[PDB]
Swiss-Prot record:
One of its GO terms (cellular component) is postsynapse. Glycans are attached at residue 35. The C1q domain is the ligand-recognition domain, which specifically recognizes and binds the Fc regions of IgG or IgM immunoglobulins. The collagen-like domain interacts with C1R and C1S proenzymes. Core component of the complement C1 complex, a multiprotein complex that initiates the classical pathway of the complement system, a cascade of proteins that leads to phagocytosis and breakdown of pathogens and signaling that strengthens the adaptive immune system. It comes from the Eukaryota. Core component of the complement C1 complex, a calcium-dependent complex composed of 1 molecule of the C1Q subcomplex, 2 molecules of C1R and 2 molecules of C1S. The C1Q subcomplex is composed 18 subunits: 3 chains of C1QA, C1QB, and C1QC trimerize to form 6 collagen-like triple helices connected to six globular ligand-recognition modules (C1q domain). Interacts with CR1 (via Sushi 24 and Sushi 25 domains). Interacts (via C-terminus) with CD33; this interaction activates CD33 inhibitory motifs. This is Complement C1q subcomponent subunit A. Keywords: Collagen, Complement pathway, Disulfide bond, Glycoprotein, Host-virus interaction, Hydroxylation, Immunity, Innate immunity, Repeat, Secreted, Signal. The C1Q subcomplex is inhibited by sulfated molecules, such as triterpenoid sulfates, heparan sulfate, or chondroitin sulfates. The keyword Repeat applies. Residues 1-134 form the C1q domain. It comes from Homo sapiens. Ca(2+) binds at residue 88.
Amino acid sequence: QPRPAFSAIRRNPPMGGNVVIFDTVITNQEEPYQNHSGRFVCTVPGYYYFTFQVLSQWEICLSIVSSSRGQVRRSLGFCDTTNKGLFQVVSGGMVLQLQQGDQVWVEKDPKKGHIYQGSEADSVFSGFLIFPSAKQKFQSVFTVTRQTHQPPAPNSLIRFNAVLTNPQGDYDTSTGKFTCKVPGLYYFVYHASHTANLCVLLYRSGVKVVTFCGHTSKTNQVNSGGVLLRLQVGEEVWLAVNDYYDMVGIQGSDSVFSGFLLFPDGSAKATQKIAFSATRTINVPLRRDQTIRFDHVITNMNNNYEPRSGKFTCKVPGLYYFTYHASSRGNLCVNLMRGRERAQKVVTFCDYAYNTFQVTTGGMVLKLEQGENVFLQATDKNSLLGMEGANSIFSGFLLFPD
Ligand SMILES: [Mg+2]
């Protein structure tokens, strides 16, 4: 069984060109990613998820581009134009259906291309196979996007009117809702561009699950959020806004919503359906080197996440994707940790905020051995909020169960 999955970061990247080269490989199962060029190469045709979290201090606009038969296919873009010298993370992601030989990479706008260079924090590009193309009725995947210059109405459901992929029709662009056909464990994630305050709320069958808010005046930022949910047939999932409703991106900064089935109910081996999502609801100030506890479990299939510590511990060796979204009111750096009793830093994600509210994100594909821990660790920059209406969440799931 193919297991194509990678993550790479920047450390000593080659200079020049508009392709963003992530030169330092963290994970590269089947070696599809080329660290000398920045390009992922598809061997196994199918549906893949790609995502990036890139650190800037000025203006940055990025886009996930692909090629087929060497013909370039431009796509959505994501920008942060805060432009104040402080760490900002721009994020974006989408499902892509690929053929053998297709390539995928991140490109910067030659006019807005500032990417941090140094050791204080990291930028990451990740991708992994979701479903091989070879089934389709028993899969579920979508990436949809909001193509309009007019923002949603306050306190309303966010309609994504345009489809990038939706092969089962599980997202309905005329209602704005995803409806479950194949019951099981799903990942949902969004990246929404805005130039005024924006809160995005994710609903499941009429109940608010998580909320993430980002504040800005005039300049463009990306609000991100996501969660793993175990759904039954007929359940609905959708995004909405509250009184903070702005989704007006600048030119080149779009808004996307994706979801995909990871583990069907009643298929394969339950011991390998491993996924967790947990939020933080305690507001005690963190101290440097403290493990960040996410105490409230939304999902914890096979109980490999420990909410009382905040640590994931690997039972089933394999490739895992870890991700978080943290609300914050000041400067925040988090170390992503991997190891056993003595854990080691994989990356640090920093996102600074001056007298405002932010949501930041990071993610990583990691190969894990039985017994290895993965968790988030606090630094001296510890502004982290966890509350209804500004959540912080930590999630992880096994790639390639059966
Ligand atoms: Mg920020």
